[PDB]
Design a protein around this ligand. Structure first.
Ligand SMILES: [Fe+3]
Ligand SMILES: [Fe+3]
Ligand SMILES: [Fe+3]
Ligand SMILES: [Fe+3]
Lengths: 115, 115, 113, 113
């Protein structure tokens, strides 16, 4: 299947696994998703991190819900960093998932508990 | 794992699994993807099929490649149909994958051999 | 602003062509760029996407019907051409907005009879 | 065509705000719609996306830096606000194009010093 192709652990050299960091003041959550924020992943017209989708899967919940989708659309100058910040309100607890795409290295995922 | 939330089997009384139909003439490939072409899926502002992505995983290939992404953005009038046609050139043989999203029923997938 | 950057012509065909067929309320729309004279399709230069809007008569604003992204430009080569399907009994104007990674925004329109 | 449909008045806040921070070539850009005066945010009425363009002073075309979709409008409630990051040593103009599902396209601009 296609889900089989979704990786969640890097291989040395390149960095793909999305990093999910959040901040929460009551109901409003602040989420930062990124790829190669320290050890940058290549970013050129031929090889780059095209986009990152953010899902939220509430506890006692059947389906993950797509919160947002960000596209890094230029890879020369300007050079768009595969890094973004999303804003959403919710009163539920659950886990956040990040799905990222490298144009030549497929899909990648990660997660974090929204406490 | 978000990967494990992806479904490939419908539950009685709602189509979600995307159907993939292709027509190849030489190096030219025409792909039609859709959800509930015969037995429609609900299409309202509260419930609908938001988008479908088409990946091509060539044989002797390590990663699936995203060919295209189409978004059905309105759900009143006009009512955007979760059905679309893509066009691409390739000389490789391989497997085609469709990833679709229902805003309340999550991610779904299917595949077809690109002979 | 941004609207002023939106072109209608050529430079290399960039103008998105809109073609539709109607069967009652169902409109089948094909949008494309350089279907005769192909536009460059390479990682460095290509058509990235097209948005299809419908501005119904007796309606103040245009409504986004669908958006398509042509995401690979090597092999496979995603041709900047797509077909949408949407139901509507109304009549009006169809707008198509396409984007070239190095030549900006291009628009076009056709009457939906 | 589409050009004429793009507003920048005030519908109820629709006009997308652009704010940025600069550290060398690295530009932190935050785009939003109605952070002061919240725009409706329901399945029927909401801001769906915002596109951020950069038009270099010595460039003839505006380049799409990034795009963001706010995909859920119940709970969670994706707020139409995002932060982008891009590198560029050049200066010029920044454009934001936001879309409301029932009020169309809106635009704004800010000089990138
Ligand atoms: Fe990579
Ligand atoms: Fe559903
Ligand atoms: Fe071009
Ligand atoms: Fe509005």
């Amino acid at each position: 299947m296609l889900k089989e192709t979704i990786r969640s652990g890097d291989w040395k050299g390149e960095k793909h696994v999305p990093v999910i960091e959040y901040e929460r003041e009551g109901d409003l959550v602040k989420v930062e998703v990124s790829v190669g924020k320290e050890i940058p992943h290549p970013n050129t017209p031929e090889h780059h991190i095209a986009w990152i989708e953010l899902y939220f899967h509430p506890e006692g919940g059947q389906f993950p819900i797509l919160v947002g989708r960000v596209e890094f659309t230029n890879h020369s100058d300007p050079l768009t960093e595969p890094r973004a910040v999303f804003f959403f309100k919710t009163s539920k607890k659950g886990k956040l998932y990040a799905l990222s795409y490298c144009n030549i290295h497929g899909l990648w995922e990660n997660e974090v508990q929204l406490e």
